[PDB]
Amino acid sequence: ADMHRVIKRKGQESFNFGELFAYTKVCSHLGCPSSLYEQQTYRILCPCHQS
Amino acid sequence: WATSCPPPRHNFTELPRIRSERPAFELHYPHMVERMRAEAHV
Amino acid sequence: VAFPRLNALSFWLFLFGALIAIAGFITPGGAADFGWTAYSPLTDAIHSPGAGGDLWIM
Amino acid sequence: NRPNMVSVGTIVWLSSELMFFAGLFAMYFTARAQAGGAWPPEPTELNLALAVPVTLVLIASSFTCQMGVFAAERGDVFGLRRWYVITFLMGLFFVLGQGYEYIHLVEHGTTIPGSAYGSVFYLATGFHGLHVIGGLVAFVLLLARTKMSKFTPAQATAAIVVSYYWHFVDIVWIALFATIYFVR
Amino acid sequence: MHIEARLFEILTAFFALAAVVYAVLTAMFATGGVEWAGTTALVLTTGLTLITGTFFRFVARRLDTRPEDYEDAEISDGAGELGFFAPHSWWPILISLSFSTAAVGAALWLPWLIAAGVAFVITSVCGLVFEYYWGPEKH
Amino acid sequence: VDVEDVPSAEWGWSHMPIGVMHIGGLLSAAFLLVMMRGNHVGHVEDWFLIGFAAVIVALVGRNWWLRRRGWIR
Amino acid sequence: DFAKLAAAQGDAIDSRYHPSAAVRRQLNKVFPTHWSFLLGEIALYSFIILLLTGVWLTLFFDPSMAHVTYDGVYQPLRGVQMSRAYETALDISFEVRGGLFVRQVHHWAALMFAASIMVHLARIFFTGAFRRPREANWVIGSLLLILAMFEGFFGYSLPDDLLSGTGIRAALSGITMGIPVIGTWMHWALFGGDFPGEILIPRLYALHILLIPGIILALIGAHLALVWFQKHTQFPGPGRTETNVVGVRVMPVFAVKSGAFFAMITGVLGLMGGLLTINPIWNLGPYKPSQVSAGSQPDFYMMWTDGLIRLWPAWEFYPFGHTIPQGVWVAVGMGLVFALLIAYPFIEKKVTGDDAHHNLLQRPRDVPVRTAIGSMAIALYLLLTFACMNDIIALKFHISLNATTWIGRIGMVVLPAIVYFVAYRWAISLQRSDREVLEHGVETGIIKRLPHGAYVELHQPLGPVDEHGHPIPLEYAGAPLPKRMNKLGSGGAPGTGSFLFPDPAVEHEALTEAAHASEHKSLTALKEHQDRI
Amino acid sequence: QSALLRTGKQLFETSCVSCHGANLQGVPDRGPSLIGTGEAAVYFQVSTGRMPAMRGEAQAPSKPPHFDESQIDALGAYVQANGGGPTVPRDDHGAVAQESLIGGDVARGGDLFRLNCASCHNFTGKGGALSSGKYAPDLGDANPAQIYTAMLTGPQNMPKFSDRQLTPDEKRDIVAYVRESAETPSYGGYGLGGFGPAPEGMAMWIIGMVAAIGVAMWIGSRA
Amino acid sequence: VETIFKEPRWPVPGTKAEKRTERLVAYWLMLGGLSGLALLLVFLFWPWEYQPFGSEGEFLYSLATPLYGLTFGLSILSIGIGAVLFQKKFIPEEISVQDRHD
Numbered sequence A: 001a002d003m004h005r006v007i008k009r010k011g012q013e014s015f016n017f018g019e020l021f022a023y024t025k026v027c028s029h030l031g032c033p034s035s036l037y038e039q040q041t042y043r044i045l046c047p048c049h050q051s
Numbered sequence B: 001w002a003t004s005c006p007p008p009r010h011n012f013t014e015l016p017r018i019r020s021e022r023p024a025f026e027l028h029y030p031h032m033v034e035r036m037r038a039e040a041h042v
Numbered sequence C: 001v002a003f004p005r006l007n008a009l010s011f012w013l014f015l016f017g018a019l020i021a022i023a024g025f026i027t028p029g030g031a032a033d034f035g036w037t038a039y040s041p042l043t044d045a046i047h048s049p050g051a052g053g054d055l056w057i058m
Numbered sequence D: 001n002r003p004n005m006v007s008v009g010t011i012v013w014l015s016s017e018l019m020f021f022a023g024l025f026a027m028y029f030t031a032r033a034q035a036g037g038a039w040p041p042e043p044t045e046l047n048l049a050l051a052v053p054v055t056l057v058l059i060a061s062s063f064t065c066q067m068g069v070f071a072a073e074r075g076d077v078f079g080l081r082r083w084y085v086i087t088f089l090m091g092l093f094f095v096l097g098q099g100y101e102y103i104h105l106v107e108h109g110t111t112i113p114g115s116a117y118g119s120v121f122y123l124a125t126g127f128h129g130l131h132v133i134g135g136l137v138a139f140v141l142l143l144a145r146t147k148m149s150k151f152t153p154a155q156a157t158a159a160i161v162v163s164y165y166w167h168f169v170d171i172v173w174i175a176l177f178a179t180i181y182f183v184r
Numbered sequence E: 001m002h003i004e005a006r007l008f009e010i011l012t013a014f015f016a017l018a019a020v021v022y023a024v025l026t027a028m029f030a031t032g033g034v035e036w037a038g039t040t041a042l043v044l045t046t047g048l049t050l051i052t053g054t055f056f057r058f059v060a061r062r063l064d065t066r067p068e069d070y071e072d073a074e075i076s077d078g079a080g081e082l083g084f085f086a087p088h089s090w091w092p093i094l095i096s097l098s099f100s101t102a103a104v105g106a107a108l109w110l111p112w113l114i115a116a117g118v119a120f121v122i123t124s125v126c127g128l129v130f131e132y133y134w135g136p137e138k139h
Numbered sequence F: 001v002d003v004e005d006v007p008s009a010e011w012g013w014s015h016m017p018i019g020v021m022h023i024g025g026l027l028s029a030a031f032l033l034v035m036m037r038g039n040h041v042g043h044v045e046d047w048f049l050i051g052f053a054a055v056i057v058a059l060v061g062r063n064w065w066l067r068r069r070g071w072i073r
Numbered sequence G: 001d002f003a004k005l006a007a008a009q010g011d012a013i014d015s016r017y018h019p020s021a022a023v024r025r026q027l028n029k030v031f032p033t034h035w036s037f038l039l040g041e042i043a044l045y046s047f048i049i050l051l052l053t054g055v056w057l058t059l060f061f062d063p064s065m066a067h068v069t070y071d072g073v074y075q076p077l078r079g080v081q082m083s084r085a086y087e088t089a090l091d092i093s094f095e096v097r098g099g100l101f102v103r104q105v106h107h108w109a110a111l112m113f114a115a116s117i118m119v120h121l122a123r124i125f126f127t128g129a130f131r132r133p134r135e136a137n138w139v140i141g142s143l144l145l146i147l148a149m150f151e152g153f154f155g156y157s158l159p160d161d162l163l164s165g166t167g168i169r170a171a172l173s174g175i176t177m178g179i180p181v182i183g184t185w186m187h188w189a190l191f192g193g194d195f196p197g198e199i200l201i202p203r204l205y206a207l208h209i210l211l212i213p214g215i216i217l218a219l220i221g222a223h224l225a226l227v228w229f230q231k232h233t234q235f236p237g238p239g240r241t242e243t244n245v246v247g248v249r250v251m252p253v254f255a256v257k258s259g260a261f262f263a264m265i266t267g268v269l270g271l272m273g274g275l276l277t278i279n280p281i282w283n284l285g286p287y288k289p290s291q292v293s294a295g296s297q298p299d300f301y302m303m304w305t306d307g308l309i310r311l312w313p314a315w316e317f318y319p320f321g322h323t324i325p326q327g328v329w330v331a332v333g334m335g336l337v338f339a340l341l342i343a344y345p346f347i348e349k350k351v352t353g354d355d356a357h358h359n360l361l362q363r364p365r366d367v368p369v370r371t372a373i374g375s376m377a378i379a380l381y382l383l384l385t386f387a388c389m390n391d392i393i394a395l396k397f398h399i400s401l402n403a404t405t406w407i408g409r410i411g412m413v414v415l416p417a418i419v420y421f422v423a424y425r426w427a428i429s430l431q432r433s434d435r436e437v438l439e440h441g442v443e444t445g446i447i448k449r450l451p452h453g454a455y456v457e458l459h460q461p462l463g464p465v466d467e468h469g470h471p472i473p474l475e476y477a478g479a480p481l482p483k484r485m486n487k488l489g490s491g492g493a494p495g496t497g498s499f500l501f502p503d504p505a506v507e508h509e510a511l512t513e514a515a516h517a518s519e520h521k522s523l524t525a526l527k528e529h530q531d532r533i
Numbered sequence H: 001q002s003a004l005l006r007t008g009k010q011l012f013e014t015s016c017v018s019c020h021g022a023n024l025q026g027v028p029d030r031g032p033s034l035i036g037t038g039e040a041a042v043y044f045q046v047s048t049g050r051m052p053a054m055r056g057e058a059q060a061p062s063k064p065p066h067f068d069e070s071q072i073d074a075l076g077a078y079v080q081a082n083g084g085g086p087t088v089p090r091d092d093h094g095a096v097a098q099e100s101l102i103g104g105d106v107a108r109g110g111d112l113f114r115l116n117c118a119s120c121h122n123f124t125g126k127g128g129a130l131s132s133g134k135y136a137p138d139l140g141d142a143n144p145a146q147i148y149t150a151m152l153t154g155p156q157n158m159p160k161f162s163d164r165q166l167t168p169d170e171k172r173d174i175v176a177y178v179r180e181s182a183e184t185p186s187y188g189g190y191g192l193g194g195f196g197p198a199p200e201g202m203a204m205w206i207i208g209m210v211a212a213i214g215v216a217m218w219i220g221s222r223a
Numbered sequence I: 001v002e003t004i005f006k007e008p009r010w011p012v013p014g015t016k017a018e019k020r021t022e023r024l025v026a027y028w029l030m031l032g033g034l035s036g037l038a039l040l041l042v043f044l045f046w047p048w049e050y051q052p053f054g055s056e057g058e059f060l061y062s063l064a065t066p067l068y069g070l071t072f073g074l075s076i077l078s079i080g081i082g083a084v085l086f087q088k089k090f091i092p093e094e095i096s097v098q099d100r101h102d
C-alpha cells in the first residue's frame, strides 16, 4: 500500500525485487550499523549519532 | 502609607500612635481626629 | 514576616513546581489534556498514560 | 509575656497536616462502604498479636518525648538527649514493626494492586509510616544541633516543637489503629 | 490574644454543626447512606480549627495583655529586641530544587531519581536547620 | 570599569570590551541562521532558530543603540 | 632497645649519605591547609590505585583478536565465537577469584582519575594558579588531562566488547579515515590494515600499559617536582603575603593528613568497586560488525567528544571529486579545544597585560571575566556531555529525540552566552555582598524596636568604631569575610561531656578556658606576625 | 464457540468501533484496519494494556490492561474470525502458553537478540529511543507469550518477524534470553540501571567525587 | 621556617574528655582491623564461583564481589578516619611561616 510513495535514485531504479529493498547496514556517517528500521515511518535510525 | 517610598529594609524608621483602623490618616490629618469620632455613626 | 527563610522557600518551591507541570508540553505525548478538574477515571493510567499528566500531578 | 512564634507556627502547620490525613481516611471509608460485607476481605487476615505491641511502643514514645521536653525547659541538654535517643529507638522500632507486618501481609496475598482493601490499608498506614520516618529525621537533626552550640532558649523551643509533631503522629496512629484493626 | 482564639472557635462551632448536620442528613436522605469521603473531610475540618483554637486558648490564659492586645497602647511600650530573623540564606532555593528533583523522579517513576531527590532534600534541609548553629572551624 | 561598578576592579580581570560581545552576538545569530541548511525535512526547528536569532539580534541592537545614545555606559 | 636502634640506624645512614640537611629541608617545608589544595591529591591517589590494579590485570589478560570458541563457566555465552581479548576478559571476571572486584575497582579508579583532574583544573583556572611563574606548570597539567582521556579510552577498548567496539569503529576509524588528503594513510598505519584488522588490540594494549602510562608518570613526576620546588600558592588572609607560605610543616601534620587522605580515597574507590556494577562485559557480548546497540556512549570524560559529533550538522564539502565528511569538523574542533586550553595563560597575559610575579590566589568572585569565561566553558562541556546521552535522556525523561538534538544544537551557542552573563553578574554581585559587611558589619539577625517605633537590626562591627554606633568601613583584602554570627563564636559551646552524660563542672570549665586561651594566642600570633611584616 | 465470537464483538462494539469501525475496516486518520491482524496482535495489544488507545501521538504507551484474560480471548477470536492471521501459542490445557515458550538454548538466543533485537533496545533489553518521540520500551515486564506475539505481529514500529524469518524454535530461544536476562542479579553490585557509561558517570560524580570533596573539606581548612 | 603557634591539644591532664577522645580514635582503628580480618575470611571461604541462572547458589555468588568491596573498602576507610581524628585531636595544632625566596 506504500509502494506509490517510493522515490527511486538515479541509476538504482531496478535495484529492487518488487517490494523488497536491500540497503547497506553500515551508516554512511561513521560506520556504525544503522539497523533501527521503523516499519511504518520507513525511517532507518543509527543508534550511534541518531542519523 | 506612614513610611517612605520605598520603605527601608525594616519597613519603619518610626511608628505613630494607633487608635483606629486609619493610623496614617490620623497622623497626616491630626485636625480630623475629632471629626471622625463624632461623625462615625449616622 | 514570622519565618523569613520559610517565606523564601515558598517562592522557589512554587516556581519549580509550576515549571514541572508546564514542562509536560515538551514531551512527545504532550501535557495534561484532561482538564484542571482532572476527573476520574479519565486521569487514570489506562485513560491518561502519558507522562504529561504525571508531571501535572507532581 | 510573649507568644512562642515557633510553637505557633508548628501548631498551625500541624493542624493543616490533619487535613492531609483527612483525604486518606476518606479513601478508606469510601472503599469500606462498598465492601458489601467483607471488610477486610479474604485472604487478608489482620492480627492483633503484632499490631498491639507495636502500637503500645509508639504510645510509650510520647511519654519519653514529653520527658525530654521537661528537661529542655529545665535547661538540661544532656537529659534532653537521653530521652530523645530513647524515643528515637522506640520510634524506629515502630517502623521496623510496621515493615515486618507488611512483609507477612504481602506474602499472604494482601498487596496494593491485589485488592482494593490493600490500597486503602497500605497508603493510609504507609503515609503515616513516612511521617514517622520524617519524625525520626527531625530527632536526628535536632540532636545534632544540640552539640553545635550552647543550650539556648531558642534551642529549647526547637525541642518542644519537634515533640509537638511526634505527639501529633502518635495521636494520628491511634485513630488509624482503632479504625483499621477494630472498626472492621 | 483573646480575639485570635475567638476567631477559630467561631469557625470550630460552624464546622462542627455542619459536619453533624450533613452526616445525619445524608444517613437518612442521601442515596447509599452516609457520604463518607465528604463527611470525613468536614469532621476533620473541625479538628483543624479545634487544634489551633485550643492551643490559642491555652496560650492566651498564660500571658497577660500584650502591647498589641492593648486598646490604648503606646509605641514605646513595645521597645526592645523582638527576636532572631534570618538576614539572608541560599538554602531555601536548594531545598526547592531538591524537592523538585524527587517530584520529577516520582512523576516519571525513576527509582534512582527518587532516591537522589530524597537524599538531596535531607542534605538541603540539614543545611537550613544548621545554618545559624554551625560553630567556628577547629582546624 | 572602575571601583563603583566592579568593587574588585584592581584585584583581577574585570573588563571585557563591548565590541567583542556585540560582534559575538551577531555571529551567534549568524550561526543559528546558517544551521537551517541541513538534511532535516521539518520546519519546526527552523522557526525556533529564526526566533532565537531574532531575539539575539534585537538584544544586540538594543544594547548598541542605548550605548550610542548615552543612556548606558 | 628500640630507642637505641633508632639512633643506631640513624647514625649509620648519616655516616654514609649525610642526608641531614636535605631531609630537614624536606621535613620543614610548609604547605597551606586549604581544602581545595587536596583536590590534586585525589588525581594522584587514583593514578596510584590504577597502577596497582593495572599490574594485577596484566597477569590474566591476553590482548589478541584471534577468534576462539568460548568454553568457560558463563552459560549464556557457551560456544559463541569471540577474540582472545574478550575470552580472557570474561576469565578475569568469572574464572579468577577477586578478578571482577579488581576489574571494577580499576574502572572506577579511572573515572575518579578523570573526574579529579577536571575538578582540580577548575580550581587552578578560577583561582589564577596558572599565572606567572606557573605557566609551564599549567601546560604540563593540560597534557596530563589529554593523555588521561586517551589512556582511559584505550582502557575499555581492550576487552573487545560490542559496546566499546562500536565506539572504536566510529570514533577511531570513521573520523580518522574522513581526514583530508592524509586520512586513510593514518587509519591504514594505525590499524595495520582495514577495520578491524588483527593488530589494533595488541597495539592498543601496549600503548595503554606501557607507553601512555609511562609518559603520564614522567609528566606527573615533573608536575609534582615543580609544585614541590616552585612552592604552593596560598589564598590571601591574615599573615599571608607574596614572599612567604602560611600553613603547616610536612612532618608530621602534612604527612599524616596526606597519608590518611590516601587511605580514605582508597576506601571510597574500594567500596564503589564492590557496591556498583561497572562495565558488565558479559552482558555486552563479543564485538561483531553486524551488531549494534542504542546508547553506545563512551565514558563521561569522552562524552563531550561524542556529543560534538551528534550536535554538529551534516556539513560536508565535495571539492573536485573529493569528499570532506562531517568528521573533519569534530577533528578540527577537538584540536582547537586542546590548543585553547593549553595556551590560556599566555592568552590571558596578552589580553590583560599582567606579567607580574603572583603567589597569592585570586578569589573567583574578584575576577568576574575569567569566572564568567570558565563558567561558560563548563556549561558548554556539560551541554556537550549531556548531548551524547540524549537518546537515554529521551527514553527515560520522555522527550523527543529530534527535540534533544535541536535543544543541544541551539543550546550549544545560546546557553554559553546565558551562563556568561549570569556568571559575570553573579561574580560582581558577590563583591557587593562583601562590601556590605565591610561598611556595615555582620548582620546578627536580631531586630530591635526603638522607643519611637524604629526597627533596626543589630550589626557586629568587624573593626574599630567611630564616634557613635556605626563602625568605620574596612578595606577589602582579598580574603573571605564572615557573614554568619555563629562562625564568630557567638554560639558558645554545648558543654564538655559525653553525648548522654555531662562531665564534671571543673573539667568543663578548665577545658573551655584552655580552648578560649588557645584561640586568643593563635589569633594574636598571626596578628603579631602580620604587624611585623 | 459461538459464545466466544459474540462476546468479543460485544466488547468491540463498545470499545474499538471509535477508531476501527464496526466492521473492522479502520477509521481513516484515526485507526488502521484490523482485518488479517490475527488473534496474536489483539492478545498482545490488550494484555500489554496498549489498547484501547486514548489519543494520537508518537507512540501509545503501555498501561494497565483494560480487559481480563477471558475478555482478551473473546476479543482475539472475533478479530481472528475476520481475515484470519497469526494466533497466540497455547498449551495442552488451552490457556496461553507461558512456561513452554522458554527455550533451552540461551546462547543462541543471545546472539539472535544482539543481531535482531538489541538495536532498538539495549543488550540487557532496557529500551531505547527511536526517531522522533518514539521509543522502545523496557522488556523486564513482558511475559514470554507477550514477547512471542510482539515478534509475530510487529508492533507500531518493529519489523515483523514471521515464522519463516524466525522459526518458533528461534523465537523460543530469543524469549529465553529476554526472560533470563531480566531476573539475573548483577554480579558486581548495584546494576545502575544497566545502561552503560551514562549512569556510571552520573553515579561517579554524585558519590565518589562528593565523598572525596566532602572528605577534603573535613581534612582541609576554609578561607 | 618560623612556627608562630604551637600548643598541645590537651593542656589540662586527667580529663574524661581526653580519655573519651582516645577511645574514639581507637574504635575507628579497631573497626578497620575487624573489616580487614573480615576481608581475609570472606575472600577465603565465601562461595565465589559463578552460578548459572535459576540455581540455588546464584544469590550467594551474587554477593561474593559486593562482600569483597564492603570489607576491603570499610577497612582502609576506617583506618583513614582514625588517622584523621588523631591528627585533629592529638597532634598539636601548628602555624608555620616559610620565606618563599622565589
Ligand SMILES: CCCCCCCCCCCCCCCC(=O)OC[C@H]1O[C@H](O[C@@H]2[C@H](O)[C@@H](O)[C@H](O)[C@@H](O[C@H]3O[C@H](CO)[C@@H](O)[C@H](O)[C@@H]3O)[C@@H]2OP(=O)(O)OC[C@@H](COC(=O)CCCCCCCC[C@H](C)CCCCCCCC)OC(=O)CCCCCCCCCCCCCCC)[C@@H](O)[C@@H](O)[C@@H]1O
Binding pocket: E101, E111, E112, E113, E115, E116, E117, G268, G271, G272, G275, G276, H126, H138, H139, H140, H141, H181, H182, H183, H184, H185, H186, H187, H189, H190, H191, H192, H193, H194, H202, H203, H206, H207, H211, I066
Ligand atoms: C562514603 C561513600 C562511599 C560508598 C557509596 C556507595 C553506596 C552504593 C549504594 C547501593 C549499594 C547496593 C549494593 C547491593 C547491590 C544489590 O545486591 O542489588 C540487587 C539488585 O537490585 C536492583 O534490582 C531491582 C529489583 O530487585 C528487580 O526485581 C528489578 O527487576 C530491577 O529493575 C531493573 O530491571 C528491570 C528488568 O528486570 C527493569 O524493568 C527496570 O527498569 C530496571 O532496569 C530493579 O532495579 P533498579 O530499578 O535498577 O533500582 C531499584 C532500587 C532503587 O534505586 C536505588 O537504589 C537508588 C540509590 C542508589 C543508586 C546509586 C546512586 C545514583 C545517583 C542519582 C542518579 C543522582 C541523579 C540526580 C540528578 C541531579 C543533577 C542533574 C542535573 O531499589 C532497591 O534496590 C532498594 C534498596 C535501597 C538501598 C539504600 C542505600 C542505603 C544507604 C544507607 C547508608 C547508611 C550509612 C550511615 C553510617 C553512619 C538492580 O540493581 C539489580 O541489578 C541488582 O542485582
Ligand SMILES: CC(C)=CCC/C(C)=C/CC/C(C)=C/CC/C(C)=C/CC/C(C)=C\CC/C(C)=C/CC/C(C)=C/CC/C(C)=C/CC/C(C)=C/CC1=C(C)C(=O)c2ccccc2C1=O
Binding pocket: C016, C017, C019, C020, C023, C024, C055, E097, E100, E101, E104, E105, E112, E113, G383, G386, G387, G389, G390, G392, G393, G396, G397, G399, G403, G404, G407, G408, H192, H193, H194, H195, H198, H199, H200, H202, H203
Ligand atoms: C542536551 C540535552 C540532551 C538536553 C535536552 C533534554 C532536556 C530538556 C533535559 C531535561 C529533561 C527533563 C528534566 C524533562 C522532564 C520535565 C522537567 C521536569 C524538566 C524541566 C522542569 C524545570 C524547568 C524545572 C523543575 C525543577 C528543576 C529545575 C529540576 C529538575 C530535576 C531533574 C530531575 C533534573 C535532571 C535532568 C537530567 C537531564 C538529568 C539526567 C541525569 C543522568 C544523565 C542520568 C542517567 C541515568 C540513567 C539513564 C539511569 O537509568 C540510571 C539508573 C540507575 C542509577 C542512575 C542512573 C542515571 O544516572
Ligand SMILES: CC(C)=CCC/C(C)=C/CC/C(C)=C/CC/C(C)=C\CC/C(C)=C\CC/C(C)=C/CC/C(C)=C\CC/C(C)=C\CC/C(C)=C/CC1=C(C)C(=O)c2ccccc2C1=O
Binding pocket: G041, G049, G052, G053, G098, G101, G102, G105, G223, G224, G225, G227, G228, G255, G256, G257, G258, G259, G260, G262, G263, G266, I072, I076, I079, I080, I083
Ligand atoms: C584487595 C584487592 C584485590 C584490591 C586491589 C589492591 C589495592 C587497590 C590496594 C591498595 C592499598 C593501599 C594503596 C593502601 C593505602 C595505605 C596508606 C595510603 C596509608 C596507610 C597508613 C594510614 C592509612 C594512615 C596512618 C598511618 C600514617 C603513619 C600515616 C602517614 C604516613 C606518613 C608519615 C607518610 C605518608 C606515606 C603514604 C603511605 C602516603 C603517600 C602520600 C604521597 C606519596 C604524597 C606526597 C605528595 C603530596 C600528597 C602532595 O600534595 C604533593 C604536592 C606537590 C608536590 C609533591 C607532592 C607529593 O609528593
Ligand code: HEC
Binding pocket: A035, A036, A037, A038, A039, H048, H050, H059, H060, H061, H062, H113, H116, H117, H118, H119, H120, H121, H130, H134, H135, H136, H137, H138, H139, H140, H141, H142, H146, H147, H150, H151, H155, H156, H157, H158, H159, H161, H174, H178
Ligand atoms: C526497533 C525497530 C525495534 C526492534 C529492532 C525491536 N523492537 Fe521490540 N519494540 C519496539 C517498539 C517501538 C515497541 C512498542 C510498540 C508499541 O506499540 O508500543 C516494542 C515493544 C516490544 C515488546 C513489548 C514490551 C512490553 O510492552 O512490556 C517486546 C516484548 C519486544 N518489543 C520484543 C522485541 C524482540 C524480541 C525483538 C528482537 C526480535 C525486538 N523487540 C526488536 C521496537 C523495536
Ligand code: HEM
Binding pocket: G036, G037, G038, G039, G040, G041, G043, G044, G047, G117, G120, G121, G124, G129, G130, G134, G137, G138, G139, G140, G141, G142, G144, G145, G148, G220, G223, G227, G231, G232, G233, G234
Ligand atoms: C594527572 C593529572 C594531575 C595530577 C596528578 C595533579 C596533581 C597535582 C597536585 C598533587 C598538586 C599539588 C597542589 C594541589 O593539589 O593543588 C597540583 C598542583 C597544580 N596543578 Fe595539578 N594535577 C593534575 C592535573 C592538572 C591540570 C589539568 C592542571 C592545569 C590545567 C594542573 C595544574 C596545576 C598547577 C598550576 C598546580 C600548582 C597550583 C599551586 O601551586 O597553587 N594540574 N597538581
Ligand code: HEM
Binding pocket: G047, G050, G051, G053, G054, G055, G056, G057, G058, G061, G089, G092, G103, G104, G106, G107, G110, G113, G148, G151, G152, G154, G155, G156, G157, G158, G159, G208, G209, G213, G216, G279
Ligand atoms: C591513568 C592510567 C590508567 C587509566 C586511566 C586506565 C583506564 C582503564 C580502563 C577504564 C579500563 C577498562 C576496565 C574495564 O572495562 O573493566 C582499563 C583496562 C585495563 N587496564 Fe588500565 N588504566 C590505566 C593504567 C593502567 C596500567 C598502569 C596498567 C598496567 C600496569 C593497566 C592495565 C590494564 C589492563 C590489562 C586492562 C584490561 C583488563 C580488563 O579489561 O579486564 N592500566 N584501564
Ligand SMILES: CCCCCCCCCCCCCC(=O)O[C@H](COC(=O)CCCCCCCCCCC)COP(=O)(O)O
Binding pocket: G006, G007, G008, G009, G010, G011, G013, G014, G019, G020, G023
Ligand atoms: C631497613 C631499615 C630502614 C630504616 C629506616 C629509618 C629508621 C631509622 C630512623 C632514623 C632516625 C634517627 C633519628 C635520631 O634521633 O637518631 C640520631 C642519629 O643522628 C642523626 O640525626 C642522623 C640523621 C639522619 C636522619 C635522616 C635519615 C632519614 C630519616 C627519615 C625519617 C622519616 C640520634 O641523635 P642524638 O644523639 O639523640 O642527638
Ligand code: FES
Binding pocket: A027, A028, A029, A030, A031, A032, A033, A034, A046, A047, A048, A049, A050, A051, G170
Ligand atoms: S555513525 Fe551512523 S550516525 Fe554517526
